[PDB]
Amino acid sequence: VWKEATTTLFCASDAKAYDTEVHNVWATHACVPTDPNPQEVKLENVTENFNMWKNNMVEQMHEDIISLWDQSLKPCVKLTGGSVITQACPKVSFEPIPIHYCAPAGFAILKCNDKKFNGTGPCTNVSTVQCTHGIRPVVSTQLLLNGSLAEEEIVIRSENFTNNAKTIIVQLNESVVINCTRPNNDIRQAHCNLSKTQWENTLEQIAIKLKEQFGNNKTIIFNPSSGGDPEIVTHSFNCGGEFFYCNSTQLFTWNGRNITLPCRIKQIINMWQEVGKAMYAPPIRGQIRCSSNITGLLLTRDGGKDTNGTEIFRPGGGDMRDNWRSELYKYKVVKIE
């Protein structure tokens, strides 16, 4: 029988106890070892409802990453509640590891294996598992990095597409590698490189999926963000403990085989996890370099007025629940009783 149930999950990971890297440290304390051979059972002749936008699993992960960041990081200056505290702020090793979320006894995780599952509604190819796949808690706007990819063609999802207020989550099937670098020896000047040819073709195939959703006669266009905090206006992410803010105008203007985005490292940032402000030490001299798989996007549609035949889409993000959602959309917890 079972039924949708909220319960405290526990986590599993391949974290290393000798590693002082803060994700490894957190997981070492909070998680258990992963199963070598994880079992997966198919449920023949079974239909089950899913709702990625109303999934308690997302909330539990949200809580973990907030505490992870709140525990791990050490800004030189922090403002919270009109109060200012200052502390030692050494640089730290920062690199997310995959985390698995598992159901306790008396509960179980259902997994939707249906082709082209749009995020809500019937799933006919359902299976049960002990734990989710390994999920890297990547904090980022406006692209989803190091995530999972659909084997088939691109898939776009929304709680409701005719609702302009609701975010659109794009799941790619072919990833686009992006290398960000702060040149060795302005210490805040950085830049990201990715394939032009690969990004244009990506944008095109996204527009095709958007056309399926809004109509063939609709002409699709991509514009930069309408405004907001620096974090959501730019493509913001972490790389080697440093906080990057990359100008993504070249990624989201659409109607040189490499695309170079001008980036800036910022010491003074807004905290995504709480009200206030944090200040970190300036970046290390030497080499700061990362290489991430662009695996998804967060988009927002203008709407705003009577349809002009044209639909404008802009990069989104800001609510990290959507980041977790892009990985947990296929899972739901049930009380197996």
Partner: antibody, heavy 124, light 107 residues
Framework: QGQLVQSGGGLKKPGTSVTISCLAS????????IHWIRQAPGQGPLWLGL???????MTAYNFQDRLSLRRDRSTGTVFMELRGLRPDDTAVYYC??????????????????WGQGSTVIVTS | EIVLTQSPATLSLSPGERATLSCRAS?????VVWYQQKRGQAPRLLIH???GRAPGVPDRFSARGSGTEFSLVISSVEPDDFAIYYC?????????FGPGTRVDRKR
């Protein structure tokens, strides 16, 4: 709980701009959308814009050239700037929160908490 | 965007009588929310989206509907209920309010 405390407004001359602030609880600022809504004398409420918890700004098409929204994550305050003021901008201006179907575990829409309102009077 | 219309303009009632306010939508909606407003005060949410009544709201208030037609029912009107009532739609921005239905005391 669950408070929205506004400040700003007053007598403005036509052509000028006005700024209204709205201090929210940390919980509200973190979890809820905050609308900007006005109500002129003898009229019903009119939606001007909102700020999602993600930070996304959305304004009414008829105000987008004169209206600007922003938030200060340092204190948990949101703002609206209305430029090129006209006599018919005279109204009580409200900030008001709304889950917009995004707050767990109920996921409800409905503007449940309103600020005290900021009176703006545009005239010469 | 949508267009909302309410009826009647005014509902005259004696205390104890059943009130039913109507809200009509130009196109199909999933739901609408209802607000109460007295003079000098800000709007007060009555009914949250699907579904039920806001905190502090008494049991006599109820609402239902789908698509074009929605309604707010007050089973037994009390003196505190005489006010203006608005419906509101969430299909997309800009979020429209209804013109309002005035509930006054019958004589």
């Amino acid at each position: 709980q669950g408070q929205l405390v506004q400040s700003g407004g007053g007598l403005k001359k036509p052509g000028t701009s006005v700024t209204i602030s709205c201090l929210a609880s940390e919980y509200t600022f973190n979890e809820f959308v905050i609308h900007w809504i006005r109500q002129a004398p003898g009229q019903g409420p009119l939606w001007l814009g909102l700020i999602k918890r993600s930070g996304r700004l959305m304004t009414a098409y008829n105000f987008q050239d004169r209206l600007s929204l922003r938030r200060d994550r340092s204190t948990g305050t949101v703002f609206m700037e209305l430029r090129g003021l006209r006599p018919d901008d005279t109204a009580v201006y409200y900030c008001a929160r709304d889950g917009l179907g995004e707050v767990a575990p109920d996921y409800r829409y409905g503007i449940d908490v309103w600020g005290q309102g900021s009176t703006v009077i545009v005239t010469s | 965007e949508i267009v909302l219309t309410q009826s009647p303009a005014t509902l005259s009632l004696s205390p104890g009588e059943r009130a039913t306010l109507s809200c009509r939508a130009s196109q199909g909606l999933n739901f609408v929310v209802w607000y109460q407003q007295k003079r000098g005060q800000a709007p007060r949410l009555l009914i949250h989206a699907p579904s039920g009544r806001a905190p502090g709201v008494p049991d006599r208030f109820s609402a239902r509907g789908s698509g074009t037609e929605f309604s707010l029912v007050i089973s037994s009107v009390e003196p505190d209920d005489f006010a203006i009532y608005y419906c509101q739609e969430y299909s997309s921005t800009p979020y429209n309010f209804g013109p309002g239905t005035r509930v006054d005391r019958k004589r």
